[PDB]
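Case study B.
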Amino acid sequence: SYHISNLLEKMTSSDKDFRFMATNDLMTELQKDDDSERKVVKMILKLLEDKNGEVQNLAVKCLGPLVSKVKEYQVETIVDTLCTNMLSDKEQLRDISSIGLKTVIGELAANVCKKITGRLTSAIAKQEDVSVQLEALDIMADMLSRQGGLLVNFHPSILTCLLPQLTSPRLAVRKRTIIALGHLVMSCGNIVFVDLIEHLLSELSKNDSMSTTRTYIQCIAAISRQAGHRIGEYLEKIIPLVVKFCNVDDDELREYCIQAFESFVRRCPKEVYPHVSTIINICLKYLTYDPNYNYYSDDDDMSWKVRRAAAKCLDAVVSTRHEMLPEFYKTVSPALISRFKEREENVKADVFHAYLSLLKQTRTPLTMLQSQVPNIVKALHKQMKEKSVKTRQCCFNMLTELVNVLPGALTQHIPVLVPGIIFSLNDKSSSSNLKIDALSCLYVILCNHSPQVFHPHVQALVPPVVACVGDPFYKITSEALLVTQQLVKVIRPLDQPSSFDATPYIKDLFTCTIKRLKAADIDQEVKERAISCMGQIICNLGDNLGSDLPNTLQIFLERLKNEITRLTTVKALTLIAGSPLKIDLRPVLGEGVPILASFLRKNQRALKLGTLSALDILIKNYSDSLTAAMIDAVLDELPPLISESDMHVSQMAISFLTTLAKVYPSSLSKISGSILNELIGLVRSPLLQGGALSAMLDFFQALVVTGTNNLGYMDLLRMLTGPVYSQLTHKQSYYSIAKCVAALTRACPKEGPAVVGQFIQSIRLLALLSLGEVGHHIDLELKSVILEAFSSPSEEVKSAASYALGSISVLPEYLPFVLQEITSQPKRQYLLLHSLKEIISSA
Amino acid sequence: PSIKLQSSDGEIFEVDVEIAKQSVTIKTMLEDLDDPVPLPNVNAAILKKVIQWCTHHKPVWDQEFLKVDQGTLFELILAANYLDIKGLLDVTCKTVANMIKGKTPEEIRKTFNIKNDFTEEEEAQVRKENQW
Amino acid sequence: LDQIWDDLRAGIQQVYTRQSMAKSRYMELYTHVYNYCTSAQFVGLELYKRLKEFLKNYLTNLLKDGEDLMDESVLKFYTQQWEDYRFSSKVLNGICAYLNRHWVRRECDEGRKGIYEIYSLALVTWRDCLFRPLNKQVTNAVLKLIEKERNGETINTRLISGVVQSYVELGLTLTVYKESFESQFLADTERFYTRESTEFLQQNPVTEYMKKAEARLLEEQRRVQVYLHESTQDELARKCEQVLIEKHLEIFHTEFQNLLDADKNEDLGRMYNLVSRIQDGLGELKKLLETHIHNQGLAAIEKCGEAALNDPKMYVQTVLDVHKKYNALVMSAFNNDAGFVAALDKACGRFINNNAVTKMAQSSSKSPELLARYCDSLLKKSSKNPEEAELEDTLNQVMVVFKYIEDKDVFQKFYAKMLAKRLVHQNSASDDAEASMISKLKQACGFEYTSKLQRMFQDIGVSKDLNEQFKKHLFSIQVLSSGSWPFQQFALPSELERSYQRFTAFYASRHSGRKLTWLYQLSKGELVTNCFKNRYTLQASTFQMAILLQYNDAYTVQQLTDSTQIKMDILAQVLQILLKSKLLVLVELKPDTLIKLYLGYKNKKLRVNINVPMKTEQKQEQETTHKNIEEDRKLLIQAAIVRIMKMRKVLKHQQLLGEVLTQLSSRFKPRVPVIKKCIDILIEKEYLERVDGEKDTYSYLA
Amino acid sequence: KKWNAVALWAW
Amino acid sequence: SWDSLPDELLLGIFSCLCLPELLKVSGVCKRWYRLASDESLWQTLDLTGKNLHPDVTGRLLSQGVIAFRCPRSFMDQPLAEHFSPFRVQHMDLSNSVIEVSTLHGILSQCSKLQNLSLEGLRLSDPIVNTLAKNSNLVRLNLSGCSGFSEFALQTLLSSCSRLDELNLSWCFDFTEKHVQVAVAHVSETITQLNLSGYRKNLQKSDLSTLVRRCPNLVHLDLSDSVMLKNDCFQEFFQLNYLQHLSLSRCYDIIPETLLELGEIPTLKTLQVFGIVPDGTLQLLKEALPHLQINCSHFTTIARPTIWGIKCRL
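Model:
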């Protein structure tokens, strides 16, 4: 209690040394008190006018923590006294008050802003001291930026204050006034916006001076950029005015006009359509503007900004009007291409961006682009030799998009394009991103072009790529491996004949890939791409590797046991097992089969299809060495897989069994148990449809011919036909059973007695459907039996009978009979119509 | 939501789902297990009286209902214990206590149909102990 | 009891049969109980013991069926039989509810504790008879099924939930749940995860281990909710964290350095997320980050070499690139943690104030000088007009760098001097940038320093207005105050003599009582030399103007010295500029040397800017301003010592040093020998003295 | 031609 | 016939009878008496102010009475019967006029007494030794009792550790040794304690030891203490839960120093009757308007009036 009153009394010691130290001590103490807070607040406020300079510094810098830890009411009075000090008659007092109030606002709330605004309006209005105006405008901008909605009733006042300041001699005042006006326009209201736009147009109407008109054009550009949709209503009156001032020979005036054009194009698409042609010609004319040039200074060149603005406006107009692509290719494109050589680096990026936007819009215009391709290459050839890193990235990005938009564009320009890429690759000055971009462009070029064109340049391409594989930086290695994978396809195609000798580079590619393969500690992306690249290498070129082949296969087999790289290894094995060149996978296969069989019970859908495809291809191409031990493990895990949960996996499983039955008939005795029962249960399912039917029908046709014990035509017929005779809520089950028994009958030629067997006879519907399905492609009293069965009380059987008769007819001895029976009686019309429709569909 | 209750006499009554939930035995029967449910001990008229009491309680009214003969009240007392209903059991207990309250001990033995089974010495000892 | 026991047993057998139960039979069975019980001395009649005996052998007969089953079958058997037993026991408790009403409650009231209700009796008999033999087998089956699930395969989740519920319900609370299942589960978790981590780290990279561990933790959290009790969250979470993250903190620390060497933001974020789970584990990461940033800063500065000593832009850009990269890393991967931003600040404050450049200059003051020169280069007129957006961001970044500089006074002095020179000569790229820079320096610096700059701008304004007004009365003239501007002060050529008097008269008439000292070393202009064999022009200084105007042939230096009264030291310097421009003929000079004019001078363009700064002027200026700063430092130190002694009468030496440093911390870091020397001088000035005894203590003396 | 000069004023 | 009714219905009917009604109805038949006398009925007994005999009281207690409340009862008769250990938990005998021998014999059987009260009675060394077996006494009361010794008090205090509230006040036979022993052997779980009366026996050292021993004192009272100074106030500042203080009749304490008592955050009440003169109370209230001064004339430490329990019989 007494300690605080000691310092408060000491601060008036009339000695400059005492006041400084006392203020410092109190400020230190008041950092981590009921009625003494008012006294300390008032004393700190009074110290702002101290004669000594050092005391004022502490007074103004101690207002931070003071605001931080004092009751709420004292904040109101300190803010009020600072504001009323801002309007005083002393310059130093005004400056110190502004500096302090900045920090006071920094350390925070709704009411204080409303209190501040009323005084700050008159603070900005005064033009005696530009200094205080600067921070006053900054503070108003800060308040309008954050929580400016609550100040609705102050909008006309702040507007009427802000407009006159645009004529101030100091340019900083004009700039900060424009900044404040943008924030005001962000959310002000209809009445204020109308007045502001009307005043701006009226001021632009009379060209009082060149200095002011620049400020008005800048302000209208800013308001268009900020408001957006709100300005489009008045755009009709604005456009002629801004077009008129473009012709004036002023470098800085033109730039704001073009910026306003860009803002109008981007933010007001609806109202800018009539004047797009007018804007395009202006941008085209001013894009080349550079007076003191032809192909410790203080010149202060400003003509590069107008070119940059023109390029940006062309980008904006191109990226929005999709309709006028032919006009773009007719006019804009040659001008952009011609300006690929200009000196200034910044606007080069802008013209490249404009052309990239044009290409993206392109994705007939294609023919025009193809016609213009040679000029693009001629312009890029010189630019890829530039020493600037940023310039070459633009060229590579241009080429990558050009190849994507049309595949065979660069067919005639490989001899000139390749050396630039090679030079970029083996350059010490080049950066990592540049090499990544070069490799990405090379990969896209190689993918989309015929292998013939790259044959002469393989000798030049291989060493730099092999060197880039060995780079320490890991994404460079990934990109190099991806490029090498396609280079292997190019060097030795397999789907087309070739006469190119690929022997010299085989050792280089294998050596560069194997080092990355035998790492086990490198990044994941490098590992997967190394596995894929080595698989492709062995697939395309495997008869020349020789003694190195067996070890790489063991390395592949090692990767199957991992839980993160096994799927890629499965795909690599699938690829290598299906090459036209016969690769000896037998050493791996013996342990590979049990491991691949294990992946079936891992509830990961992506892995099951891959392992099923790998097993199918492996058994298809490498039957010669298959022991009974490995096949049983695969067969044992199948029954869980066949189900109605996922039909695709069941289809792949059925295809595997079909291939096994076709190729290795001995092991088929092992499916007499759970597998066959699960398959038969799946047949009755009501969700079965599509290619699953094809796979199922192929399986039975392949199986019945094998001739295994307990699996015969009679046994299979009884097993499929059992449930109907034993005691089926969906009609689809009957159709599936009929199609299956029809397939079995088609497989076995000696089935006529069986056909008569069901022809003699719920069971009737199944027999009729089976007879109809048997008659679908093979024709064997039947007409009389069908006619007798037509008149049945079951409507669902009548449709089945109608389908059975029609399919059986599908002919010389039945078509006229069916046609006559159609007109024979009116009752036999719907059935006759259905049979005729079925015959026509099956014709 | 229809439940049928059958009494000993064979009469079939009607009780609602939320009306029979007042009996703890019926509550358990509904809780943890088109036809009638026979109650071997629930009598003809007493079942109707119990149904009426349950509907009423879905005081002066307690006295009005229990203002019946002593034998009928005693018979209805067992009904509360059988159906496991607390309110009417407590009402019957209070009514019995009030009937016994304010009555001479000598005449209560004759009124309750209970023969006096005690000795003169035992009676004297009981009276001496009750001096407090 | 016997009259109803047979029918009661027959009815109870129907309940346990788990079949259709007739509602009429239920009430008959209940009726039997009323007759059996009704006839203190409550009638128990050992019916409780009889039903206990009935329930005993039934469970033994049930156990005989499933005692020999394997792991797969025991789960299904236990689940089905437990569900059926629970339902049937509930029904039976419903049947015999009468006993619990009176006699079971009386037994507890009487104090005997060997009793339970019918449902509780059924549960206790189950626990005693069937649970005891089969608990180990059921737990082993559950553990094997869970281990199968952990390896990828799909398992039936309904079997385990029933076992967990049965274990929980048998606690009659979780006393039996923890003893029989949870301990074995946690031991199996230890055994599985230790081997999994050891095998996984040996083959796969450390980067994927973080993803594997976070996925495993999420899987455990989901699994416990799916088919386990909710009371094991914290236990399993902390145990799994201890198994996975804590054991491998050493390899995590080793990896962190490599992940710092090559930027991997997501990987660093994952490591931070994983390690944050362990309490008190992020400090060593902070130490590595600080050391790495320091080493990177010194390595980057050393790369530039001797060129960075005279090139401010490359030095500042190197520092800014390092700071921007590591600030992005801290704000993205480490989620703006206070410790990591502190580590960034500590490393920056060290590699900015001490590096290879400062060692070459032999002083730590070279960094603020280079910063000021970079700002001045940014804010001059060049061949290219800067963009508004790019300049503001660069100024913001410069202000960010300025915070870490311990010696701000050098920066303030150099910036003020360069701004004064820019204002006098009217070469500013953009005024808004200057206004923004002053607004920033207002918040970042003291009030006394900024008032000087405001005075210069006010003077420039009032002088531009004066010139504009005087133009109407009638060449540009600037008039400045004698205190605000840091400029320290020849025969006027007769060519411009008339303008001198014309301006002097107007200045005297508009305002009187003011003396105008004219400075000719800051005055520029353009030349019109007819005696040059060509019609050209050359921008030149006033000294260069007088030198060129005098020769309008060959002259001696002494003659020119007499003509213009220019000092020989500056005369040689101004003449060397003309000689270097190939506009004279006679590097060394002599007092009697004769200098002539090269007629027919050939140039690429007529407009030549010969106002090149002198060779030694920059170095002399730097040495002078460094000496001035060194002189100014002593006064502040002395004033601080005096004012701290004036309020605290007696104070110690170490406390004195600590207070002086915090007094002067916002301007520079004082050196201890300088403070000691200043104290010694103050003692010799009879401003304070040392008390007798109690050494290393000072007291104030008036 | 064109001349630019600077001077300081004191009381 | 009413003879076939079960016992549950009999208990349900009997649960709604008062003591005289049940006593009168108990003379109907032996079957009625068997149900009338049970652990059901004697849940809570009440014999406030009615004279009786130790034999009658002992037999009733052995019946299973849990909450026995017989204040101001006279039982000055010898006890000749011996009974099994009782089960009473809340026994009240304040102001009861009973013999020392009768009190010792009755207290020698109860061992599960959770609370007790012997205000106004007279005890002895053997009585205190027997009371030491009650190690679960949550509360205790000994106001106005005298006759014990320092050795007996120390053993009883050491034996009891779960005691929450104790009131060893108004002793007419305690001395400096008695006061010193009580404070030294006091439990550390005491919530409310009163030690008034010892005008010439309470010292500064005893108060300091008590403050440093038990830090959970909620209600405290030091009335009629003439050895309290500013140091005692500082000792109270060490406590953190002093929600009720009483320094009445403090002749050695100036009324001005009482303003410092307001510094306690958890202070709620303070009775300073006797020291504060007329008129100065308003000044004291104005100085500390965040508490209540002279608002509780009667104490509440271990005061049965039973402890929330309602008696039926």
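Chain E has eleven helices and ten strands. The remaining cases will be described in the next quarterly update.
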